[PDB]
RNA sequence: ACGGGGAAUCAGGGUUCGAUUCCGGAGAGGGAGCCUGAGAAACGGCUACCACAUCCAAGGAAGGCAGCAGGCGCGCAAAUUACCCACUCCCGACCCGGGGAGGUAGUGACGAAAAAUAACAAUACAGGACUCUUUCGAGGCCCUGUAAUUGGAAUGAGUCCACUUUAAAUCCUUUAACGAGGAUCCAUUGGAGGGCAAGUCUGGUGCCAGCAGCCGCGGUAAUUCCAGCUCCAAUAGCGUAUAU
């Protein structure tokens, strides 16, 4: 029932990707979740859904149409080479460390108190 | 002296405010207003006595 | 230093005399006749017309064949015609001064709902827009002060998702049916 | 203007620069005397300590006893006579209560009935005196 | 009195403001001196003295929030001891690290934009354009308003999932499910002698209390006080003070 059109489509030889703005037509139902657009474009461009990085979806007032933005890469080695790692963590293939930005700074200057190899001892 | 302070307000008899149905607010207040000022008027000789006027 | 606008304008001007009873009545005529909500929005359209007049006067002072008047002249006539307040046959800068205030309120979407016979009343028109029932070119409009353009005039009808249109029944209708057969079965 | 010379600008401008001081409203705004004599000091309001409750007489056939308080401002240390505005509001105010006082409305000018009083109380003990008058709030003790 | 770009207000002239995100300058408690460097008279660098203040084992040592938060003080007067480097950029030996610069939230009726608090129908009615009737009345080809009269029709506030959103969230938008007849899911703020929109209403008070920007009202029938009723103005705002 959902239809996808492609707009502003252009390939990137400088980044080994193709990029286009997506608009989905979903009249009467919720805005389609991002994981589902992946395979629908995979059926569209004859690719695998895991190399499909879409984001930036925001439905218009009144519903029925949601304009999103998507990337399609040449291969998975690229999709991990040139990609914001936060967008990789959307797919569970990347997971950042669990140190709050505050705790890294108390540990930073507490090592500034000591001089030499004893810098690794102050941390924890 | 200043001993007779609040004399009147203290000896004014109390009358409980009687409950009344709420007035239409918003644009409905202006709809009710426009009607009983222009469309429902009746042509009568003599000076039109005020809206709150009561003799 | 922050990345933001800080560009805010007021849309109206309060009148000088606060209790001119003559002034209080034509403002009250426009409110009741066009189903407005307060004196603000009738002052708003008066402020919208105030600019266009003085923006037209300032061009009337300059000579003809002036490239500034020639470009800005029809550019202002472009917008007034595309909103169906000025007729295309009267497109000349001296006819904007003779344009009055209720010509603008005629182009207000709320009135166009009542003008096209899609609403029982000018007040019934305003609740249809505030309840997301009509649309302009496949776009559900939620605002009665929407100034409809001349070309987007014929494309006003109910949204497809509306009981008044070809959509599901409302909350009341689905509740009058639940206990209607639930009490019968 | 009297002299309409083509190059009499410094003669015309120095004149208005001189004659402006004969305007009563202008002279008080551009001299410290009005600002130093102001107990507020250009502030719209001020907090002070009430130290006694004095009753002021009216003047012209309008005869009554106006209820006021002798406030001592805490920023300067000057003593002013604020006017307890509304009816039966003197019983809210007590002695040694800090109160927000405001101008009366004529901007440094005694107002109507009361002789030589230019200040009125608006709040008492950080609760609006109007709320005490309407009964919306009451004095915490 | 930091200057300017500018801001407020205006017919034309002007008047007033500009601490404040852009540019330029100045300064890091007060003065002074200087090291290093391409660049500093640097203060999140040193050395003094002055002021203030911390730790001490009393020998000494150490300090500079007019950075982001926060506290005290001062006052009429001003927010979280939050999240993040994803954006914007900057710095480094650098694609990789860091950035209270910055971004995102919290508080926020400073202020600005949009915009709910009902719509419709029937019935009794109060009338209006039409025909008859010298009136009276009549039907309603057509309505207009009013009435805790009745009637089902429409939605959002809220609850609430899913998605989207985002660095992770939140908000908005999107989708479901519940969600209104005194639709109690109840609009205040001021005023009603004049200026100035709006009661010679009722009760109380009796030059007292009080009102009132101004003129004034009040000394026993107050259109001005205290109240009730009604009405008027603006409407999620309105009143007061002060500068202009």
From Swiss-Prot, chain B:
The cellular location(s) given in this protein's UniProt record come to: Cytoplasm; Nucleus
Residues passing through the membrane, by range: none
List modified residues, type N6-succinyllysine.
47
State what this protein does: Component of the 40S subunit of the ribosome. Contributes to the assembly and function of 40S ribosomal subunits.
Q: How does it assemble?
A: Component of the 40S subunit of the ribosome.
Recorded protein name is Small ribosomal subunit protein eS30
Q: Which gene encodes it?
A: FAU
Covered range of the whole protein: 79 to 133 of 133
From Swiss-Prot, chain C:
Q: Where is this cross-link: Glycyl lysine isopeptide (Lys-Gly) (interchain with G-Cter in SUMO2)?
A: 92, 138
GO cellular component terms, A-Z: cytosolic ribosome; cytosolic small ribosomal subunit; nucleolus
Query: Which molecular-function annotation in GO is an example for this chain?
Result: rRNA binding
Compartments, as annotated in UniProt = Cytoplasm; Nucleus, Nucleolus
Entry keyword set? Acetylation, Cytoplasm, Isopeptide bond, Nucleus, Phosphoprotein, Ribonucleoprotein, Ribosomal protein, RNA-binding, rRNA-binding, Ubl conjugation
Its predominant location is cytoplasm
SMART domains named in the record? Ribosomal_S4, S4
Give all residue intervals belonging to the S4 RNA-binding domain: 107-181
Swiss-Prot/TrEMBL GO biological process terms: ribosomal small subunit biogenesis; translation
Phosphoserine PTM sites in chain numbering: 152, 162
Which residue ranges does the record annotate as region Disordered?
Answer: 161-185
Function, as annotated: Component of the small ribosomal subunit. The ribosome is a large ribonucleoprotein complex responsible for the synthesis of proteins in the cell. Part of the small subunit (SSU) processome, first precursor of the small eukaryotic ribosomal subunit. During the assembly of the SSU processome in the nucleolus, many ribosome biogenesis factors, an RNA chaperone and ribosomal proteins associate with the nascent pre-rRNA and work in concert to generate RNA folding, modifications, rearrangements and cleavage as well as targeted degradation of pre-ribosomal RNA by the RNA exosome.
PANTHER family on file:
30S 40S RIBOSOMAL PROTEIN, SMALL RIBOSOMAL SUBUNIT PROTEIN US4
Subunit organization: Component of the small ribosomal subunit. Identified in a IGF2BP1-dependent mRNP granule complex containing untranslated mRNAs. Part of the small subunit (SSU) processome, composed of more than 70 proteins and the RNA chaperone small nucleolar RNA (snoRNA) U3.
Family per UniProt? Belongs to the universal ribosomal protein uS4 family.
Listed name of the protein:
Small ribosomal subunit protein uS4
UniProtKB/Swiss-Prot annotation, chain D:
Cellular localisation: Cytoplasm, Cytosol; Cytoplasm; Rough endoplasmic reticulum; Nucleus, Nucleolus
Q: Where is this cross-link: Glycyl lysine isopeptide (Lys-Gly) (interchain with G-Cter in SUMO2)?
A: 36
- State where composition is biased (Basic residues): 1-19
Q: Which Gene3D superfamilies match?
A: Nucleic acid-binding proteins
Bridged cysteine pairs (disulfide):
none
- Extract the GO molecular function terms from the UniProt entry: structural constituent of ribosome
The record's keywords, sorted A to Z, are:
Acetylation, Cytoplasm, Endoplasmic reticulum, Hydroxylation, Isopeptide bond, Nucleus, Ribonucleoprotein, Ribosomal protein, Ubl conjugation
Q: Where are the transmembrane segments?
A: none
| Predominant location | cytoplasm
Q: Does the keyword Ribosomal protein apply?
A: yes
Q: Where is this region: Disordered?
A: 1-25
The alphabetized list of GO BP terms reads:
translation
Task: Please give the family membership noted in the entry.
Answer: Belongs to the universal ribosomal protein uS12 family.
Q: Which PANTHER family match?
A: 30S RIBOSOMAL PROTEIN S12 FAMILY MEMBER
Quaternary structure and partners: Component of the 40S small ribosomal subunit. Part of the small subunit (SSU) processome, composed of more than 70 proteins and the RNA chaperone small nucleolar RNA (snoRNA) U3.
Q: What does this protein do?
A: Component of the ribosome, a large ribonucleoprotein complex responsible for the synthesis of proteins in the cell. The small ribosomal subunit (SSU) binds messenger RNAs (mRNAs) and translates the encoded message by selecting cognate aminoacyl-transfer RNA (tRNA) molecules. The large subunit (LSU) contains the ribosomal catalytic site termed the peptidyl transferase center (PTC), which catalyzes the formation of peptide bonds, thereby polymerizing the amino acids delivered by tRNAs into a polypeptide chain.
Name listed for the protein in its UniProt record: Small ribosomal subunit protein uS12
């Amino acid at each position: 029932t959902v239809t996808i059109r492609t707009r502003k489509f252009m390939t990137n030889r400088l980044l080994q990707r193709k990029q286009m703005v997506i608009d989905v037509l979903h009249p009467g139902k919720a805005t389609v979740p991002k994981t589902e657009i992946r395979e629908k474009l995979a059926k569209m461009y004859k690719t695998t859904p895991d190399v499909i990085f879409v984001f930036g979806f925001r439905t218009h007032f009144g519903g029925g149409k949601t304009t999103g933005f998507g990337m399609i890469y040449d291969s998975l080695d690229y999709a991990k080479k040139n990609e914001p790692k936060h967008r990789l963590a959307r797919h569970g293939l990347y997971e950042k460390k669990k140190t709050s930005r505050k705790q890294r700074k108390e540990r930073k200057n507490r090592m500034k108190k000591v001089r030499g190899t004893a810098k690794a001892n102050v941390g924890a | 002296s200043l001993a007779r302070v609040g004399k009147v307000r203290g000896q004014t008899l109390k009358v409980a405010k009687q409950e009344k149905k709420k007035k239409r607010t918003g644009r409905a207040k202006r709809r009710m207003q426009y009607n009983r000022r222009f469309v429902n008027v009746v042509p009568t000789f003599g000076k039109k006595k005020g809206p709150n006027a009561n003799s | 230093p922050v990345a933001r606008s800080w560009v805010c304008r007021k849309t109206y001007v309060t009148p000088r005399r606060p209790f001119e009873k003559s002034r209080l009545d034509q403002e009250l005529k426009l409110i009741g006749e066009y189903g407005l909500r307060n004196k603000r929005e009738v002052w708003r359209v008066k402020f919208t017309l105030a600019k266009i007049r003085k923006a037209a006067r300032e061009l009337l002072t300059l000579d003809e064949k002036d490239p500034r008047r020639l470009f800005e002249g029809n550019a202002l006539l472009r917008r007034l015609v595309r909103i169906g307040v000025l007729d295309e046959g009267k497109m000349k800068l001296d006819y904007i001064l003779g344009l009055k205030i209720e010509d603008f309120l005629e182009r207000r979407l709320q009135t166009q709902v009542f003008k096209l016979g899609l609403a029982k009343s000018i007040h019934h028109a305003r609740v249809l827009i505030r309840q997301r029932h009509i649309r302009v070119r496949k776009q559900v409009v939620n605002i009665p002060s929407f100034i409809v353009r001349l070309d987007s005039q014929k494309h006003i009808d109910f949204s497809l998702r509306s009981p008044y249109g070809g959509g599901r029944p409302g909350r009341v209708k689905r509740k009058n049916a639940k206990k209607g057969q639930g009490g019968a079965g | 203007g009297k002299c309409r010379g083509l190059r009499t600008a410094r003669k015309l401008r120095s004149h208005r620069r001189d004659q402006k001081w004969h305007d009563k409203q202008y002279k008080k705004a551009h001299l410290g005397t009005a600002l130093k004599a102001n107990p507020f000091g250009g502030a719209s309001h001020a907090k002070g300590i009430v130290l006694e409750k004095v009753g002021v007489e009216a003047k012209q056939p309008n005869s009554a006893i106006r209820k006021c308080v002798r406030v001592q401002l805490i920023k300067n240390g000057k003593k002013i006579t604020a006017f307890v505005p509304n009816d039966g509001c003197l019983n809210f105010i007590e002695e040694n209560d800090e109160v927000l006082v405001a101008g009366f409305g004529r901007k440094g000018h005694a107002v109507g009935d009361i002789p030589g009083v230019r200040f009125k109380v608006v709040k008492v003990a950080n609760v609006s005196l109007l709320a005490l008058y309407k009964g919306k709030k009451e004095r915490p003790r």
